[PDB]
Every structure is written in structure tokens, then in C-alpha cells.
Amino acid sequence: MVSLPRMVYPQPKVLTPCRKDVLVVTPWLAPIVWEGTFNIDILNEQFRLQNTTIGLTVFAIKKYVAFLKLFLETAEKHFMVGHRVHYYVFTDQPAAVPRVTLGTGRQLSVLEVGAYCERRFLSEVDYLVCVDVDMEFRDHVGVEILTPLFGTLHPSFYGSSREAFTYERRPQSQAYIPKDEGDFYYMGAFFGGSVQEVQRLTRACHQAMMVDQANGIEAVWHDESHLNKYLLRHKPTKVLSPEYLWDQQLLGWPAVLRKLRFTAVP
Numbered sequence: 001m002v003s004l005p006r007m008v009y010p011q012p013k014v015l016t017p018c019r020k021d022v023l024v025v026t027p028w029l030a031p032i033v034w035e036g037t038f039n040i041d042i043l044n045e046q047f048r049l050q051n052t053t054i055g056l057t058v059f060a061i062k063k064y065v066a067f068l069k070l071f072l073e074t075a076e077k078h079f080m081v082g083h084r085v086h087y088y089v090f091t092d093q094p095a096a097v098p099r100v101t102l103g104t105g106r107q108l109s110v111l112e113v114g115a116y117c118e119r120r121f122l123s124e125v126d127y128l129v130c131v132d133v134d135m136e137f138r139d140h141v142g143v144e145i146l147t148p149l150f151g152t153l154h155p156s157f158y159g160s161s162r163e164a165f166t167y168e169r170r171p172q173s174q175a176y177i178p179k180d181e182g183d184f185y186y187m188g189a190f191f192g193g194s195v196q197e198v199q200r201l202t203r204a205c206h207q208a209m210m211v212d213q214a215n216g217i218e219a220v221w222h223d224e225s226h227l228n229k230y231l232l233r234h235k236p237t238k239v240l241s242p243e244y245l246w247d248q249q250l251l252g253w254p255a256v257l258r259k260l261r262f263t264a265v266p
């Protein structure tokens, strides 16, 4: 909207790709986010000028409330630092949520679950990021991920053929995807986008899962199976590389990953 200020940075090289070892753009022209593909200073300027507020949602039910301290503490060190952040912790144990110190411009809301407004999100944040709680941030996760709708490449299938993707393969399921279809296998542990797009996705998945339940069938990987069906038919405007969803214990640290940003907790 408003003009960017004068900035001094390395000139992009038209005849010199940033990354030659990986695909950095999808066939529908959506950027695939890898380290080396973005200048975070330019992106931070663009999003700060818009006074962008990012909502980060996590569910912590039962024993998972134990993952909240590390999750939040590391989010404070690596997630959208410099921007407005609103954490939404849905839990069945409100009093169990740890007292984590937050930086300025960041807030946390505890929402008790077991039953209990989506209009709230529309008036409080610009983007919604939905992640699993048994994780920790190890490096920068910033505005480079923000876009109308994004999905993240599952670390186990980024180099696999579509036939190997663990999509729901039964035609009787709404999440059905035949062997000759599919772009990528997205992991349900990290997705997001504008509030409107995220709500459209969740409403679509909720309805598809209800239809499956009525037909007596449960998708092989539940919610994730439906997420993949949705993103197949509604292409994400950005795709995050495995840098954003990794497990160093089970997968190590491949040369193709210059940074391990968000990882599973052992």
C-alpha cells in the first residue's frame, strides 16, 4: 500500500538462481519457501507497513499441555519477531497453561475447550497460522510464509513420487485422491493463510469429515488426508519447504536444508 523506504541490499541476479538444487516455484506460480529465496528485510518492511497481526493457534489437550512452555518460549525467540502476534491456546486445562514472558506487541489468549467464535479471528488478526504443539522453534519463521493460503511439505515425502504419497486411496472417502493425481503431500502440522482462507479450508474439511462419518469411513490420516484433498483442488499461494517441519532425530540434517526452523520434540 504505502511506499517502501530507500533500502540498500544486493541486486538480484536474473541469470543467477538463488537455489539450483530445489524447485522454488510451483507450476501454478506459487513460491516454495527455502532459505536463500527471500530477503527478509524487504518482506519485513512490506508487512510492518501494513501493521500485520499474525494469529498462532495451538491445541493442548490432556498430556499435551506439557509441550506449551517450550513451544511458546521458542516461538518468542523465532516466530514473527518484530510483528504483532496473538497466540490462541485451546485447552481443556486453562490453569495448566505456563506463564511465559512475552515480548512487546505480543499477546496470548487461553480458550477453554470441550465445546467452546470464528468472527473473533476476523476482527483480531490478519493471518492465521495453525500448528501442532509438540514442537519447538529452532530458527527464523517469519513473514516470508504469509500469503492467502499455504501448506507445508511433509518431511517424509518431499522427494517421493505421488504414487508413494499416503493420500486416502478409497473412492468412498471425500478425501479420495487417485494415484495419477497430486502435487505434493502436505503435513497437517503447519498450515495457514488469511483468516478468510483458513476458515474456508476448515469449514470444507469439517463438512467432508462429517460426510465420511455418515458413510462409515475414516480417512487414513484423518484431518491431514482432507487437508491434502483441499489443497489439491484449491492450490496454495505459497508452499513451505521441509525447513518448516522437520525431525532431526528421525531424518537428520540433509544438505538441502540450510536451516531447521520448526521441529518435533523428542
Ligand SMILES: CCCCCCO[C@@H]1O[C@H](CO)[C@H](O)[C@H](N)[C@H]1O[C@@H]1O[C@@H](C)[C@@H](O)[C@@H](O)[C@@H]1O
Pocket: 155, 156, 166, 187, 188, 221, 224, 245, 246, 247, 250, 264
Ligand atoms: C516431522 C515429523 C515427520 C516424521 C515421519 C512420520 O510421519 C508420519 O507421516 C504420516 C503420513 O504418512 C502422518 O503424517 C503422521 N502424522 C506422521 O507421524 C507423526 O509424526 C512422527 C514424527 C511421530 O511423532 C508419529 O507418532 C506421528 O504420528
Ligand SMILES: O=c1ccn([C@@H]2O[C@H](COP(=O)(O)OP(=O)(O)O)[C@@H](O)[C@H]2O)c(=O)[nH]1
Pocket: 058, 059, 060, 061, 062, 063, 064, 131, 132, 133, 134, 189
Ligand atoms: O490428546 C491429544 C492429541 C493431540 N493433540 C493435538 O493434536 C496435534 C497432533 O497430534 P499428535 O502430536 O499426536 O500428532 P503427530 O504429529 O504425532 O502425527 C498435537 O500437536 C496437539 O496439538 C492434543 O492437544 N491432545
Ligand SMILES: [Hg+2]
Pocket: 057, 128, 129, 130, 198
Ligand atoms: Hg487455525
Ligand SMILES: [Hg+2]
Pocket: 201, 204, 205, 206, 208, 226, 227, 229, 230
Ligand atoms: Hg477438506
Ligand SMILES: [Hg+2]
Pocket: 201, 202, 205, 206, 223, 224, 226, 227
Ligand atoms: Hg483440514
Ligand SMILES: [Mn+2]
Pocket: 132, 133, 134, 189
Ligand atoms: Mn505433532
